[PDB]
C-alpha cells in the first residue's frame, strides 16, 4: 500500500478544485510545453505565445480576486508552479514574474485606475511584463541601487536614470515595473511601457542556465514617467520585498517538480539500463541515492502544503518562505546533480533532460535571495542579531 | 509574527487534548526527569520507579483502547515521545519498549486471556518488560536468529535455547517477549517471566550511549514455557516487524525533541557567550548552523504530524515510517554534533548536556533498523528490486 | 611567508626542466588557448589545429622515449595536463586521448612496424586519433561489449561489426584504436584509418559538458582490417585497462587546474565585488568557502606529485590512480559549483567561465571510471571481496 | 602490488631512524599503553607514570637539541604522535602539552638558567607540566584574558590573579606555564611551581571526551612569582601563538593514527561479521565507506609528511599548520563516526574502542583553534581581509 510517487498521501490534502486545476495544467504542460523544450533550451528561445496560452487557461495571477483572475488558492498556485517547473524552470520563471512580480504589486500597490488598466491584459497574457530591481552594483543589497527618480514639479512627472541587469523577460516586455530611489529617500515603484523614449532593453548572451527564458537589462536614459504611473501603495523597500516573498512561495513549490522529474527519470533509467548483466537499479549504491532524493522531495512537499494553507489564512511570515525557498532550492540542486551522475555519459546530453535541470536550478538557488542570504535572514529572526554586515 | 520556536505553526494542527497531554507530560518531564538525568547518565543508573511514575500518568501504551490504557491518538503518542526524548533518549527508549514492543504485541497478537492478565500491570507500570529479538549473530537480518523453540507434546510446552543481546530493560524486567524459530519453520513469540529456571539476564557494561537506560541480555538455558504463553496471533517475522514499525513511529517523533533541546541550548549559549567583544550569535558562521538546525527540525515535525494522522486512519505503511525514522535520526545526529561544536570546550561536558545527546542518538540511528538498512527498504519499495543481498 | 597560491611549496619539489616545461606551456595556453575558448565552448567548436600547435611544442605523448617524443617525466606530464585543464577540460581531454589512449597503447602494445609508422605523425599532431571502447550497451562493464571481430583465414584479416558511442575526437579522427571481442574470447585492439569502407563516425549533438571538444561515435559495418593492424601486444581487457590507468593519471592532475582557476576567479571576484558597502571577501561565509577550496586543491596536488614520482619508478598501482582520479574529480566538482555560487547571477554566464568548468567536470567525474566505480575498485583492493555484482 | 595499508608508499619517504623510532614507540604503545586504556578511559584515570615511561624512551621534547632531548626530526615527532594517538588522543595530548607547550616555550623563550634548570627534568618526565592560556571568558579570543600580573618594584616579583580553565594535566602538574596580561600591556609567560601559596588546581568532572587524560583549572589568588620565573623571550601573544603552532603540528599527525585505528577496526569487523549469510564487507554501501576513510587518511599523511620536511628547513608557516590541523581533525571525526556506525550495536561499546575515538576527536577538533577559527585564519591569509569580527 506504499506509493513511492506520493509517500505520505499529499493527494488527500488537496481539494477537488486544486486537484482538477493541477491535472488540467499538467495536460497543457505535457502536451504543449514538453514537446518544445528540447530546442527552446538548446537555442535560447522563448516562445512569447507561451504566455498567451497560459493566458487562456487563466493561470497568470491566479490568486488575485477579480480583474479577470481566477482567485484560486495559494496551494493551487504552488501546484501550478510545480507542474510548470516539472517541465523547465525558465518557463516557470516567466510565469512567476508575470504573476507575483508584475501583477501582484500592481494589484496591491497600485491605484484602482492602474489595476483596471493593466491587470486584465496581464491575465489574458496580452501584456508580458517584468520586475526590474537588481542592478549591476546592487544584488543582495538593494539599499545600494543607483537608479534615481527626480521630480518635475512643472510637468507632474519623474525622470529616471539607471541600469537594471539580469531582468527576466525584459527583452520582450511591454510593461516594466521599475524600482528607483527618490529624492525623499524612500524607494518607489514606477510603471514603464515599451516605446518610451530613453528606455532600451538589450538581451544578455552566453547564459548556461534558464536558456529557454529571455533575460535582458533595463537601461533608462532620462525616461520621463507621468505621476499616474507611480505605484501609490509602496513608499519603500517593502514594495519589492512584499512581492518578493510572494515569488519565493512559488519557487518553493516549483523546484519540487524539477526534482520529481529528475527522480522519475533516474528511477526509470536505473530499471531500464543494465550493466554487469543486471539493471542498475539492483545496486545498493544506486538505491540509496533514490532513497535520499525521494526523502527530501517528500519533506519539502508537505512543508509547502502547510505554508500554502497558512498563507490563505494570512498567517504566513517572510521567514517561513525564506525557509522553504532556501531549503527546497538547495535540495533540488543536489537531486539534479545526483540524477545527472546516475545516467552516466547520457546524463550530459540535453536529450536526457536532467542536465537542463541541474543547470536551471543553478540560477534558482541564486535569484530571489541567494542561499546564504536566506540563511542570515533566518538567523536574524532566530537570534535577533543582524549578521549581514559589520 | 515569526516564531523561531514553531516556524510553521504546528500548534494550530493539534487538538486541545493533544495539547493538554503534551504540556501535562512536559511538566512531569522537566520537574521529575531533568533534575535526575545528569547523574543517572554519568553513573549508568536507571530509576525503575520512573516507569511507575509514567504508569500513574497513564503514558504507557497510550493508544491501546481499554485494559486501562488512554486510547489516545498517534500524534499524542509522538508528542509524548518528543517530550521524553527532549530529556534523554534512554528514558524515551524505556517507555518505547514498554509501549510499542511489549504491550502492543500482546494486545494485538495475544489471546484475550493474555491481554487481561498483562496489559493492566504494564499500563500501571507494575510490570517492566522488554523486547528480545536481536542476537549476537543476528542483527539486521533476523531470518538468521539461532534461538530455537522445541515442542513437548507430552507436557504441552516449548523449550527455548538461545541468547539475545543488546536487549533494553532486560536486566530489570519482569516480563520478556522473546521471539524464537520453531520446528514448523515460522518464528513465534513467547512470553517469559523472571524467575523461570533457565532464564538469566546479565547486564552490559561500558556503554557510551544511552547510559541512563538499562541494557542486558537474555540467556535461555532450556527455559520451559507453557503453551498458554505463546503469542497465538503472530506466526512469523511479521509479529516483530508489525510491532517494530509502531516503535519506529515513536522514534521519528522522539529524536526531534532531542534536536530541539540541542538547538535551544546552542541558541542561548550563542547569545550568552561572548568572544571578540560580542556575542557568538553575531557571527555568520554561527547563524548558518542555527539556520540549518531549525530547518531540518521543522521539516521533520510536519512530516511526523502528517504520518500521525494517516496512522489513525490506518493508512500508514511500513515504508512511510522507515522514511521518517531514517531521516529524523540522521538529521538529529548532525544537529547534536553541531550543537556540541558551538559550545566549544564546554561542549564536551555532560553538565552542558549536548554531549549526552550526541552520544545517545548514536544508538538511536543504529537500532530499530540501521540508517543504510532503511535506505534499502525504501529502495526496494521504489524500484521493486531487492538490494539487501546477492 | 605564506603563499595562498602554493601553500606547501610544491615548487621546491619540481625539477628545473619540469618547471620550464610548465611555464612554457602555460604561455602557449594563456596566449593561444584562453582567447579562443569563450566561443569554442559557446558554439561547440573544436579547432583541429590546436592539436598541430601542441604537436610543435612536442606535448603529445611526452613520456614516450624516442619516435620523436619528449620522453619527459610523469610529473611533467601531470603539470602539462594541469595547465591545459586550467583552460578547459575538453581541450585537455583531446590531448589526453592522443597521448594516453592512442599513442601509449600503440607504443606499448604494437609491433615495431606499427610504432615506426604511427608514433611520429601522432607526436607531430598530423594524425588526430581516438580511443573506441565504450558502447551503447557497455559502459562501466566492458566485458559486455558487442563489437565482434571475425577472422578471414583466406584474406589474412578480421571483419569488425559494432557501435562505439561517446568517443572523443572520433568525428575528426584519422586513426581509430578500436577494441573488439574475438572468436578466441580474448578482446583485442584494432587500428582503423578513416576512409575504410564500412567505417563512419557521426557526431553527437546537445552536449552540455565538454562542448569545445568533438565527440562522436564509431560505426563499423563489416569494416575489414588487415592482420598487420591488430595490436600484437594486448590479448585481453588489460590492453585498454593498462592504458586507461595512464589516462586517469593525467586526469588526476588535470582537474586540479580547473579548480585552481575557479578558486582564483572567486577570490578576485570576492575582493572586487562589493555589497552592503564592503567587498564580499569580508564575510565569514565567503572566507570558509575559499578556505575549503584551497585545502582540497593542496591535498590533491601533493598527492599527485607523489604518485608522479612512484610512477617513474614503476611503483604505481592501478588502485593508487583510481584513488586520486576518484578523489580529485569529486572535489573539483564541488569547488566549481561553489565558485559558481559565489559569483551570483554573473556566475551563470560563460563570460565568467566558472559555469563552463562546473559543466565540464560533470563529464570528467563520469568518464574513465565513474565515481562510485572507482570506489568499488578501492573496496575490492581493501577487503579482497568483489562488490560490483551479485 | 597495492597495499591498502600504505597506498602511496609513505615508507620510502622516511629515514631509517624515523622508521626505527616509529616502530620502537609502536611497541611501547601497543605493549604498555593499549592494555591499559579500556579502564583508564572508563574510569577517568591518568597513570602519571605513563609520562615517566615516555621519559625513559626520550620521546618528550624530541626535537629540542641538547638538554637531554633527542633532537630528532619534525617528521619523527609527527610519527611519534601518530602512534600515541593510534592508542588514545588523551594520551597523545598529555605528551603534546609536555613537548610543545611546556618544554618548547621554555627552550625558546627562556633564559639559559631556566632551560638548564627545567628542560632536563621535563625530558626525563620527572616534571609533569601544563600550558595555561585559556580562561572561562577567553577561548578563541586570547586578547580578552583577565589574568593580570602586577609588579612589585620592592620585592622584584609579580603578583598574578586569574583563573585558567580546561587546562590539560593541571591537576597533577609540577610546573605551570601561565600567560597573563601585564601593566605594560604586553602579555607575558610566567613559570609556576606547585606548592606556591595562592595556586590551586582543581579537576574538572563529567568529561565525555579525553577521559584518560587529566584536565583541571589553574586558580591564582595573588600568587607571587619571582622575576627569574618570567619568560624573558616572549613579550606578547606570539609566545603562546609560536608554541601553539608547534602543538598543532603534532595534532595534524596525531588524529591520523586514530583514524587508521578506526579504519583497521571497521575493515576487520566487516570481514569478520556476517549478516544475510555473507560478510558485511561484501556490500557496496560498506565498501564506499572504507573507500572514503582510506582516501582522506592518505591525503592527510602525505601532506603532513611534506610539512614535516618544510618545518625542519624553517619554511613552515602558521597557516600551513592551520590548514592541516583544521583539515585532519575534521576528516578524523567523520571517519570515527562512520566506523562507529559500521559496527552497529557493538559500536556503542568502549570494548570496541571506536566510540572512544569518536568522543576524543570531539575535543581535538575544538581545542588549539576551533574548526571555523582555522578557517578564518586561512581566509585572512588568502583574501588579506580580517573576518573574525566587525
Ligand atoms: C536567469 C536569471 C534571471 C533573473 N531575473 C531577475 C528579474 O526578473 N528581476 C530582478 O530584479 N532580478 C533578477 N535576477 C538577479 C537576482 O535577483 C540577483 O542575482 C540576486 O538578488 C543577487 O545576487 P547577485 O547576482 O547580485 O550577486 P551578489 O549579491 O553579489 O552575491 C554573490 C554571492 O555572494 C554572496 N553574498 C552576497 N552578499 C553577502 C553577505 N552580506 N554575506 C555573505 N555572502 C553574501 C551570495 O550568497 C552569492 O553566493 C536574475 C538572475 C538569473 C541568474
Ligand atoms: C542502547 C541500545 C539498545 C538496544 N535495545 C534493543 C532491544 O530492546 N530489543 C532488540 O531486539 N534489540 C535491541 N538492540 C539492537 C538493535 O536492534 C540492533 O543493533 C540492530 O537491529 C542491528 O544491528 P547490529 O548491532 O546487529 O549490527 P549489524 O546488523 O551487524 O550491522 C552493522 C552495520 O552494518 C550495516 N549493515 C548490515 N547489514 C547490511 C547489508 N545487508 N547491506 C549494507 N549494510 C549493512 C549497518 O547499516 C550497520 O552500519 C539495541 C542496541 C543499542 C545500541
Ligand atoms: C565528453 C565525454 C567524452 C567521452 N569520451 C570517450 C572516449 O574517447 N573513449 C571511450 O571509450 N569512452 C568515452 N566516454 C564514455 C565513458 O568512458 C563512459 O561514460 C564510462 O566508462 C561509463 O559510463 P556510462 O556512460 O556507460 O554509464 P554507466 O556505466 O551505465 O553508469 C551509469 C551510472 O551508474 C553507475 N554504475 C554503473 N555500474 C554500476 C555498478 N555495478 N554498481 C553501482 N553503480 C554503478 C555509475 O556510477 C554511474 O553513476 C565519454 C563520455 C563523455 C560524457
Ligand atoms: C580535553 C580538553 C583539553 C584542553 N586543554 C587545554 C590546555 O592544556 N591549555 C589551554 O590553554 N587550553 C586548553 N583547552 C581549551 C581550548 O584551548 C579552548 O576550548 C579553545 O581555544 C577555544 O574554545 P572555547 O572552549 O573557549 O570556546 P569558544 O571560543 O567560545 O568557541 C565556541 C564555538 O564558537 C565558535 N567561535 C568562536 N569565536 C568565533 C568567531 N569569532 N566567528 C565564528 N565562530 C566563532 C567556535 O568555532 C566554536 O564552535 C582544552 C579543551 C578540552 C575540551
Ligand atoms: O530576483 C528577483 O527579484 C525575482 C525573480 C523571480 N523569478 O522567478 O525570476
Ligand atoms: O531494535 C529493536 O528491536 C527496537 C528498539 C526500540 N527501542 O526504543 O529501544
Ligand atoms: O573513458 C575512457 O575510456 C577514457 C577517456 C579519456 N579522456 O580524457 O577523454
Ligand atoms: O589549546 C591549547 O592551548 C593547546 C592544547 C594542546 N593539547 O594537545 O592539549
Give the DSSP letter string of C216-278.
EEEEEEEEEEEGGGB-TT--STHHHHHHHHHHHHHHHHHHHHHHHHHHHHHHHHHHH-EETTE
Cβ of A245 less than 6 Å from ligand 5: no
Put simply, the answer to whether C378 touches D302 (Cβ < 8 Å) is no
Query: To one decimal place, what's the resolution in Å?
Result: 2.7
CB under 6 Å to ligand 4: residues? B 273, 275-276, 280, 283, 285-286, 341-342, 344-345, 348; D 97, 130-134, 139-140, 166-168, 209-210, 215, 363, 366-368, 370, 372-373, 388
Who's near C297: CB < 8 A, 6+ residues apart? C256, C259, C260, C263, C331, C335
- What contacts 24+ positions apart, CB below 8 Å, involve D203-208? D203/D171, D204/B349, D204/D165, D204/D166, D206/B38, D206/B42, D206/B349, D206/B350, D206/B351, D207/B348, D207/B349, D207/B350, D207/D44, D208/B208, D208/B348, D208/B349, D208/B350, D208/B355, D208/B356, D208/B359, D208/D359
**Chain A CB contacts of B379 below 8 Å:** 284, 286-288, 290-291
DSSP reduced 3-state for B43: coil
CA dist B38 and D380 (Å) reads 41
Q: Which ligand is nearest to the CA of B326?
A: 2
CA of B110 vs chain A CAs: smallest distance (Å): 25
Mutate which: D163, D366, D388, vs B, most B CBs within 10 A: D366
CA dist B170 and B166 (Å) reads 9
String of DSSP letters for A199-244: EE-PBP--B-SSTTS-EEEEEEEEEEEEGGGB-TT--STHHHHHHH
| Closest CA in chain C for residue B283 | C284
Q: Is A235 on the interface with B (CB under 8 A)?
A: no
Q: What are phi and psi of C19, to 5 degrees?
A: -65, -50
Q: Which of C291, C320, C376 sits opposite D284 (nearest CB)?
A: C376
Which of C80, C90, C96, when mutated, tests ligand 7's pocket best, judged by the most ligand atoms within 8 Å of its CB?
A: C96
DSSP D349: B
Taking alpha carbons only, the member of C376, C379, C385 closest to residue C141 is: C376
Q: What are phi and psi of C300, to 5 degrees?
A: -65, -50
Taking alpha carbons only, the member of D102, D375, D54, D74 closest to residue D250 is: D74
- Give percent helix, percent strand, percent coil of chain A, each to the nearest 5: 55, 15, 30
Scan residues 58-117 of B and list those with Cβ closer than 8 Å to D: none
CA dist A69 and D4 (Å) reads 67
Q: Which of B284, B389, B390 sits opposite C283 (nearest CB)?
A: B284
Pairing of strands A274-275, B148-152: unpaired
Measured by CA distance, the residue closest to atom 2 of ligand 8 is: D368
How far, in Å, are C55, C92, C292, D294 from residue C82 at the CA level? 18, 8, 20, 25
This entry's atomic model was obtained through: X-ray
Which of D367, D371, D372, D387, when mutated, tests ligand 4's pocket best, judged by the most ligand atoms within 8 Å of its CB?
A: D367
Cα separation of the two ends of chain C? 55
Compute the distance from residue B368 Cα to the ligand 2 centre, in Å.
7
Which of B141, B247, B248, when mutated, tests ligand 6's pocket best, judged by the most ligand atoms within 8 Å of its CB?
A: B247
Q: Is A172 on the interface with C (CB under 8 A)?
A: no
Scan residues 339-368 of A and list those with Cβ closer than 8 Å to B: none
β-bridge partners, C132: C178
Q: Is D270 on the interface with B (CB under 8 A)?
A: no
DSSP reduced 3-state for C179: strand
How far, in Å, are A100, A254, B10, B304 from residue A300 at the CA level? 21, 11, 15, 13
CA dist C295 and C7 (Å) reads 9
Compute the distance from residue C292 Cα to the ligand 8 centre, in Å.
24
Measured by CA distance, the residue closest to atom 4 of ligand 7 is: C368
Q: Is B383 on the interface with C (CB under 8 A)?
A: no
A279 sits in which H/E element: strand A278-279
CA dist C105 and C177 (Å) reads 9
Would you state the cell numbers that stand for residue A232, as one nine-digit string? Answer: 501609490
Cβ of D339 less than 6 Å from ligand 2: no
Put simply, the answer to whether B208 touches D285 (Cβ < 8 Å) is no
Q: Is A288 on the interface with D (CB under 8 A)?
A: yes
CA dist D316 and D185 (Å) reads 29
CA dist B369 and C87 (Å) reads 48
Touching subunits of C (3+ CB pairs, under 8 Å) are: A, B, D
User: How remote is the C-alpha of D250 from its chain's centroid?
Assistant: 6
D369 sits in which H/E element: none
Please identify which residue in the block is written with the cell numbers 507621468.
A226
Taking alpha carbons only, the member of C270, C306, C301 closest to residue C285 is: C270
Please identify which residue in the block is written with the cell numbers 564575510.
C283
Nearest atom within ligand 7 for CA of residue C367: 1
**Chain C CB contacts of B389 below 8 Å:** 390
Indicate if the alpha-carbon torsion angle D286, D287, D288, D291 is positive or negative: positive
Helices (H) and strands (E) in chain B, counts: 12, 9
The residue ranges of DSSP E strands in chain C, in sequence order, are 129-132, 148-152, 157-168, 175-182, 187-193, 199-200, 215-226, 274-275, 278-279
Compute the distance from residue A51 Cα to the ligand 7 centre, in Å.
44
Nearest atom within ligand 3 for CA of residue A275: 38
CA dist A266 and A278 (Å) reads 16
Pairing of strands D215-226, D157-168: antiparallel
Q: Is B291 on the interface with C (CB under 8 A)?
A: no
CA dist C269 and C27 (Å) reads 23
Compute the distance from residue B240 Cα to the ligand 2 centre, in Å.
15
Compute the distance from residue C175 Cα to the ligand 6 centre, in Å.
64
Which of C280, C336, C337, C340, when mutated, tests ligand 1's pocket best, judged by the most ligand atoms within 8 Å of its CB?
A: C280
DSSP reduced 3-state for A151: strand
Measured by CA distance, the residue closest to atom 4 of ligand 6 is: B368
Taking alpha carbons only, the member of B234, B377, B388 closest to residue B318 is: B377
Scan residues 138-157 of D and list those with Cβ closer than 8 Å to B: 138-141, 144
β-bridge partners, D145: none
Put simply, the answer to whether B285 touches C285 (Cβ < 8 Å) is yes
Q: Is C380 on the interface with D (CB under 8 A)?
A: yes
Q: In chain A, what are the domains?
A: 1-128 (1.10.540.10), 129-235 (2.40.110.10), 236-390 (1.20.140.10)
Contact C78, C249 (CB under 8 A): yes
CA of B240 vs chain D CAs: smallest distance (Å): 18
Q: Which of A285, A389, A390 sits opposite D288 (nearest CB)?
A: A285
β-bridge partners, D161: D148, D221
Give the number of other CB atoms < 10 A from CB of residue A98.
Answer: 29
- Over the range B133-153, which residues count as b (16 or more CB within 10 Å of their CB) and which as e? bbbeebbbbbeebebebeeee
Amino acid at each position: 500500500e506504499f506509493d513511492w510517487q506520493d509517500p505520505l498521501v499529499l493527494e488527500e490534502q488537496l481539494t477537488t478544485d486544486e486537484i482538477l486545476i493541477r491535472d488540467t495544467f499538467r495536460t497543457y504542460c505535457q502536451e504543449r510545453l514538453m514537446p518544445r523544450i528540447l530546442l527552446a533550451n538548446r537555442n535560447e528561445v522563448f516562445h512569447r505565445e507561451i504566455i498567451s496560452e497560459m493566458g487562456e487557461l487563466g493561470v497568470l495571477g491566479p490568486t488575485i480576486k477579480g480583474y479577470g483572475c481566477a482567485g484560486v488558492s495559494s496551494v493551487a498556485y504552488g501546484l501550478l508552479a510545480r507542474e510548470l517547473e516539472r517541465v523547465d524552470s525558465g518557463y516557470r520563471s516567466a510565469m512567476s514574474v508575470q504573476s507575483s512580480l508584475v501583477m501582484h504589486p500592481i494589484y496591491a500597490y497600485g491605484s484602482e485606475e492602474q489595476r483596471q488598466k493593466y491587470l486584465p491584459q496581464l491575465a489574458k497574457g496580452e501584456l508580458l511584463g517584468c520586475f526590474g530591481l537588481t542592478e549591476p552594483n546592487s544584488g543582495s543589497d538593494p539599499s545600494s541601487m543607483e537608479t534615481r527618480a527626480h521630480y518635475n514639479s512643472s510637468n507632474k512627472s519623474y525622470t529616471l536614470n539607471g541600469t537594471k541587469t539580469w531582468i527576466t523577460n525584459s527583452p520582450m516586455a511591454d510593461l516594466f515595473v521599475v524600482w528607483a530611489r527618490c529624492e525623499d529617500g524612500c524607494i518607489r515603484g514606477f510603471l514603464l511601457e515599451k516605446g518610451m523614449r530613453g528606455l532600451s532593453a538589450p538581451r544578455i548572451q552566453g547564459k548556461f542556465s534558464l536558456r529557454a527564458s529571455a533575460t535582458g537589462m533595463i537601461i533608462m536614459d532620462g525616461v520621463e514617467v507621468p505621476e499616474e504611473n507611480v505605484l501609490p501603495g509602496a513608499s519603500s523597500l517593502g514594495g519589492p520585498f512584499g512581492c518578493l516573498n510572494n515569488a519565493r512561495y512559488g519557487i518553493a513549490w516549483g523546484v519540487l517538480g524539477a526534482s520529481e522529474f529528475c527522480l522519475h527519470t533516474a528511477r526509470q533509467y536505473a530499471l531500464d539500463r543494465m550493466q554487469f548483466g543486471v539493471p542498475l537499479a539492483r545496486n545498493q549504491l544506486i538505491q540509496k541515492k533514490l532513497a535520499d532524493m525521494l526523502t527530501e522531495i517528500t519533506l519539502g512537499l508537505h512543508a509547502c502544503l502547510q505554508l500554502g494553507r497558512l498563507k490563505d489564512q494570512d498567517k504566513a511570515a517572510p521567514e517561513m518562505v525564506s525557509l522553504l525557498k532556501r531549503n527546497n532550492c538547495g535540495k533540488a540542486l543536489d537531486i539534479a546533480r545526483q540524477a545527472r551522475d546516475m545516467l552516466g555519459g547520457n546524463g550530459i546530453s540535453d536529450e536526457y533532460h536532467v542536465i537542463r535541470h541541474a543547470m536551471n536550478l543553478e540560477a534558482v538557488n541564486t535569484y530571489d535571495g541567494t542561499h546564504d542570504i536566506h540563511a542570515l535572514i533566518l538567523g536574524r529572526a532566530i537570534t535577533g542579531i543582524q549578521a549581514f554586515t559589520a
